[PDB]
Amino acid sequence: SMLHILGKIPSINVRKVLWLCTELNLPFEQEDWGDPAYLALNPNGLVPVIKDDGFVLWESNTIIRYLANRYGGDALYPAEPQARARVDQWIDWQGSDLNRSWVGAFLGLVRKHQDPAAIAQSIAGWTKHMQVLNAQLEATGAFVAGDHFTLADIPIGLSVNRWFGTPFEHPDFPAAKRYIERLATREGFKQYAGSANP
């Protein structure tokens, strides 16, 4: 009956959900997933998928929106259309654009994609996206979507954690560094991010 979260902890998309549950003080049961039993839940064969008293849901960014909508307060995921859109914008950018930019460099330098040119190119594309994000963080001076922690800081925070947790010569993005150090005081970030969880 209680919330079940299916998917291995190393998955960044699974940790979006785990960290959100910590923010919400929502109890859960987590299960490692790399099978019809699973495909019955998520026909795409990807992690995470949740079960919430009979309600089955996949897509990590959808799942965090759902848990926020059901259990969370307004600050976490604001109802006002413009404020909500700023939060959605960075969630959607994380899930469709930013996460694609790191593939070669992450799989190559962290997960062991060993072509020097390909890695250099991924770092280049990742850098250009991190450049956009760094500029936003300078502009707010605080969190990704404004002056306080929101749902967007979960996908964005984990993605910045991934950037610093990938071994290469990092270009100076001071605002990104400020941001990750600010998130590091949060219980969920200590558990599901940091160098231990690239």
Q: Which does 81 bind (CB under 5 to 8 A by kind): ligand GSH, its own copies, none?
A: its own copies
* CA gap 4, 31 in Å, rounded: 8
Site string for ligand GSH, 114-143 (x = CB under 6 A): ------------------------------
Query: Which residue reads 């400020």 in tokens?
Result: 178
- Asked if 3 and 29 count as a contact pair (C-beta separation under 8 A), the reply is yes
# binding residues, its own copies (CB under 8 A): 30
DSSP conformation class of 122: H
11 annotated as a binding-site residue:
yes
Which parts of 38-57 interact with ligand GSH (CB under 6 A)?
46-48
# binding residues, ligand GSH (CB under 6 A): 12
* CA gap 51, 67 in Å, rounded: 12
Which parts of 97-156 interact with its own copies (CB under 8 A)?
97, 99, 129, 132, 135
Bridging pattern class, strands 3-6 and 49-52: antiparallel
Question: Is residue 59 a contact residue for ligand GSH (CB under 6 A)?
Answer: yes
Strand partners, 49: 6, 58
Question: Is residue 58 a contact residue for its own copies (CB under 8 A)?
Answer: yes
Least spacing, CB of residue 52 vs ligand GSH, in Å:
16
* CA gap 163, 37 in Å, rounded: 34
Query: Nearest-5° angle of CA 60, CA 66, CA 72?
Result: 120
* CA gap 174, 9 in Å, rounded: 28
Residue ranges in contact with ligand GSH by CB under 6 A: 11-13, 46-48, 59-61, 95-97
Q: Name the residues that contact its own copies, by CB under 8 A.
A: 43-44, 46, 55, 57-59, 61-63, 65-66, 69-70, 81-82, 84-85, 88-89, 91-93, 95-97, 99, 129, 132, 135
